[PDB]
Amino acid sequence: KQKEAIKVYLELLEVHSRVLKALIEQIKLFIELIMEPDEDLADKVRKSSEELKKIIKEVEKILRKVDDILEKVKS
Amino acid sequence: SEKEKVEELAQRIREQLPDTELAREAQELADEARKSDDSEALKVVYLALRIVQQLPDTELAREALELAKEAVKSTDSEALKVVELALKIVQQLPDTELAKEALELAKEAVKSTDSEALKVVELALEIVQQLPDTELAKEALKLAKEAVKSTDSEALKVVYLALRIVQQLPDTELAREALELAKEAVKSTDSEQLEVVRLALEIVQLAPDTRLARAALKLAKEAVKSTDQEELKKVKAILRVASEVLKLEEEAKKSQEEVERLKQEVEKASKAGLGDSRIFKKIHDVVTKQIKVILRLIAVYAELVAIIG
Amino acid sequence: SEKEKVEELAQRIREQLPDTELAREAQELADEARKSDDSEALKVVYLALRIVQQLPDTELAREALELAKEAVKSTDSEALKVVELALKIVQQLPDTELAKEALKLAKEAVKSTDSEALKVVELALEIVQQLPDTELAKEALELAEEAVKSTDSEALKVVKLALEIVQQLPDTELAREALELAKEAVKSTDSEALKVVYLALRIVQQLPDTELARLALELAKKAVEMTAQEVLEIARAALKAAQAFPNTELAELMLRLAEVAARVMKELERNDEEIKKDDESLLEDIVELLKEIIKLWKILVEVSDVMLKLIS
């Protein structure tokens, strides 16, 4: 019912806070790369991108859970 | 009681060296102070007479008397505080070049009508007082003396920010880098370099002891060294974007704290049963704020993209 | 020379309809034009009198006489050209709503002394003359009317750019979309929407016949549809990024990212509407929001990779 939407919104809030942190790191590193080109800075930017991809995977898991619940409701 | 102290020092000075120019000037200054009801001017005159009693028949005492008279003439409280700090520096560090330089800087500050030069000179004097016998004090005093001469207000703001950075983190690489950058910016006649240095110093103050701060300092140094105008505008835009990113980071941290508190409150309300519609409304408010912060971050991302191209 | 033509038309009109208000107005206009030595004022009075001779005792002739008098009062060459084009349109499409609305717009332009409004109205009249008896001419005329009525300085420039786009690519999907977008922007009271629409139209004109132009048109339409200022700020940032870096795959990805973010905000609004009131519909809207969220983050990852390739 509504508690399911509540828990989905909570999961989204936590994921989006982690997104905020990763995005701030990514923008800081991009400014640093613009001002000075380095290879290790590019490596840590790639690490940030990997973190963002893991976040995307978590969002996909949330979506598949909600989809299973919707498919059970429609039955 | 301050009037009593001033008059007692006046009588002590009159008994110390009568029939001298310093004695007559001290008597007249003590009279003009007794006429006053302002305690700050009373402290000014007290420090002046204390310096006179400290060094009788000297040039420093004459400078102190003249500066104290000109400060009593002024109605601005900031000039009063500046003269107080200058005379107090002369008292704390006698027989030092910094005392004479600070007296000259305080005279130049009182003579100026601008309100920002008073703050700048007060900051320089506080730097001298808190860090005596240090290169930072002399460099800050020289920087303030150079800032008073410049016509541009941007130079005043830049030197204010540089002295602030020095006071916040003394004996750090950031402080000496900010001092050198502010000196080289005051030397340059260009105002765009002043804007770049101001933005870099603001980046430093917003995020002290961070990688962004030192990176922006190095970029501002190499931009002051450079002579390309397009790269100068690009550096200005990059520094503005960095400052916006710092502000957005603060906002995002506040939003994350809100998210944690909302999760706690949601679990508490689910345990208690206090109903679901109000919880959904609070969740909607928090989601709105967080997603607006995310969208601002995306906009800054696209702005950076436009800058690099 | 031209005075001869004007005075002959005046005497012929006097012989055609005596003891009428139109006769007195035409004679006064002819006398005032005869006193004037300017060639353009003489040509405008000639057109007005020829219109009076073509449509005697009609409202169009009265409005043309009044417009000719007001143009004689004005010294701006652009306003004179506007009045001349309006009268030539009246002659070109007699007894049409386009001619009446064009006379009205010409009067509204003459009233204002600003040069940008005169240029916009001249552009609209050139559109009407170039495409007579077409819906695009009607839309451009109404858009210019709405622009002149608006006090915002950006609205005039936006409408001028839209009309330039229409003239450059007539009877195209891009021109129709630009007309509708400019109309919706003038309808909007927000200035951020006007700036976003100007950026979109500038992207269309600066790079026609490209996917980025269509993307910018879609993004600007969806931004004007939304009432949120944040979506407009995102659209403005994305359009500035696209304008600064054209003919690139990364700008395409950036416009796509902005569109996905606008769709995410739309799904947020839908979720709010459903909260204000079924569980199944709420779950479906949550599913759609999660889909668009995943797309947004994927596009952000792609943008990050492309920027890393550009900086390395």
Residue numbers in the entry:
A (entry chain C): 1 to 75
B (entry chain B): 1 to 274, 278 to 312
C (entry chain A): 1 to 277, 282 to 316
List passages from the publication reporting this PDB structure.
Over the core heterotrimer in both structures, the backbones are very similar to that of the base heterotrimer crystal structure, but the resolution is not high enough to determine the state of the designed hydrogen bond networks. The designed junctions between the repeat protein arms and the core bundle are recapitulated in the crystal structures and hold the repeat arms rigidly in close to the designed orientations. Deviations between the crystal structure and design model in the repeat protein arms increase with increasing distance from the central bundle due to lever arm effects arising from the compounding of small orientational differences in the structures of the individual repeats. These structures show that the DHTs can serve as rigid interaction hubs in asymmetric assemblies, which have been more difficult to design than symmetric ones. Subsequent two-arm fusions were made by combining the two working one-arm fusions and testing nine more new fusions to chain B while keeping chain A constant. Eight out of the ten designs tested had three equimolar bands by gel; six designs had a distinct heterotrimer SEC peak present with the ABC species detected by nMS; and four had a very good fit to the design model via SAXS (Fig. 3f (row 3), Extended Data Fig. 3 and Supplementary Fig. 1). To test this idea, equimolar amounts of individually purified A, B and C of DHT03_2arm_A21/B21/C were mixed together and annealed to allow these interfaces to reassemble in the presence of all components. A monodisperse SEC peak containing all three chains by nMS was observed at the same elution volume as the co-expressed tricistronic version, indicating successful reconstitution of the heterotrimer from independently expressed proteins.
